[PDB]
Structure 1
């Protein structure tokens, strides 16, 4: 398998969206960056914030599009093309409505599953990148999906998500070292303590 060399977190820019569920991807990558001392800087050429540094012995790029969620491909696509990074070396972390808080899965391939950030990316780089699906829960009905992803979770659900994100963080070494099947087993087995 390919080592993961680019890790992307999906979300919206600005303080008003920083704590919302739809930024789950941003939480993972920001926390990963600070865990390893990687600095995320403004990178207007690619419509995002990005960084590069050593994670567990591998040189890894980190990216947060600043396009707004539904336009995320305007950053992920030219960035990965410029550095010639194949989809198979990419992991994209994102909120997953179809899984509850505290559930987290690593997935390879497939389509966007209705996720409007992934909808903007699959068309242009294809589906064969890896995804870290961070469960944010489903509110109950189609009509409330937007207010749920665009809202801040209560502290109980937030702890569940943070516990799930902490677990995936501990598996990133397997991902960057090319061990994707092991990482998938070990991430996917998580259940809150």
Structure 2
């Protein structure tokens, strides 16, 4: 199983299919796919856990990566059984997700808290509790609430995409701290990111 607060499972939230791959609600997929390429972790089909998943070495630590293929609001149907099967406690999980309550180009590491309205996190917290870590990738808010599906399922304009891409890149550089259990330092260094 996992061991303490060394991060050993990194989940990226999103929806499957080409039609959703560039949408804001796939920000977590972007981060995990980029992380997998950085470290040479193969993301392969994982039908048992309704996802795409991988396993490999990050900086001397055995780490698993998971992209649920459930659709966002059923993400727990992948995350929960996967984490349970591999005996990964919440404290060793990082979930990367889009965050409506933060600007494009803002990124933060958070431990605990609720779903903040995010329909993927909403499907996970009831089962494993809140005590996992989150990489909150700011995407902005559309203003109004009847309109959240339109914003998160949109493809950001180029300036906003560039801001998110820079924040994600910064966070990739801090995964070494996370897999080493240096959550406080990683939090400080991630949360200090500015785009310019």
Match of 2:97 in 1: 94
Secondary structure at 2:147's aligned position in 1?
A: helix
Cα distance in 1 between the residues matched to 2:169 and 2:73: 26
Q: Kindly state the Cα deviation for residue 42 of structure 1 after the two structures are TM-superposed.
A: 0.4
Q: Kindly state the Cα deviation for residue 144 of structure 1 after the two structures are TM-superposed.
A: 1.9
Secondary structure at 2:173's aligned position in 1?
A: helix
Cα distance in 1 between the residues matched to 2:170 and 2:177: 12
Q: What is the total number of aligned residue pairs between the two structures?
A: 193
Cα distance in 2 between the residues matched to 1:159 and 1:96: 16
Cα distance in 2 between the residues matched to 1:27 and 1:144: 23
Secondary structure at 2:174's aligned position in 1?
A: helix
Cα distance in 2 between the residues matched to 1:106 and 1:115: 16
Q: Kindly state the Cα deviation for residue 148 of structure 1 after the two structures are TM-superposed.
A: 0.6
Task: Kindly report which structure 2 residues correspond to 1:60-79, keeping only aligned pairs within 5 A, or say none.
Answer: 60-79=63-82
Secondary structure at 1:7's aligned position in 2?
A: strand
Q: Kindly state the Cα deviation for residue 57 of structure 1 after the two structures are TM-superposed.
A: 1.0
Stretches of 4+ moved more than 2 A in 1? none
Secondary structure at 2:161's aligned position in 1?
A: helix
Secondary structure at 2:94's aligned position in 1?
A: strand
Secondary structure at 2:131's aligned position in 1?
A: coil
Aligned partner (choices 180, 184, 189) of residue 181 of structure 1: 184
Structure 1 stretch displaced more, 178-187 or 135-144: 135-144
Q: Deviations over 1:14-44 (max 9, x none)?
A: 0000000000000000000001110000000
Q: Kindly state the Cα deviation for residue 142 of structure 1 after the two structures are TM-superposed.
A: 1.2
Q: Kindly state the Cα deviation for residue 139 of structure 1 after the two structures are TM-superposed.
A: 1.4
Structure 1 unmatched runs, 5+: none
Secondary structure at 1:4's aligned position in 2?
A: coil
Q: Kindly state the Cα deviation for residue 140 of structure 1 after the two structures are TM-superposed.
A: 1.5
Cα distance in 2 between the residues matched to 1:139 and 1:22: 13
Cα distance in 2 between the residues matched to 1:145 and 1:40: 29
Q: Kindly state the Cα deviation for residue 2 of structure 1 after the two structures are TM-superposed.
A: 1.4
Q: Kindly state the Cα deviation for residue 143 of structure 1 after the two structures are TM-superposed.
A: 2.2
Q: Kindly state the Cα deviation for residue 3 of structure 1 after the two structures are TM-superposed.
A: 0.2
Secondary structure at 1:143's aligned position in 2?
A: coil
Cα distance in 1 between the residues matched to 2:46 and 2:149: 29
Q: Kindly state the Cα deviation for residue 168 of structure 1 after the two structures are TM-superposed.
A: 0.4
Structure 2 unmatched runs, 5+: none
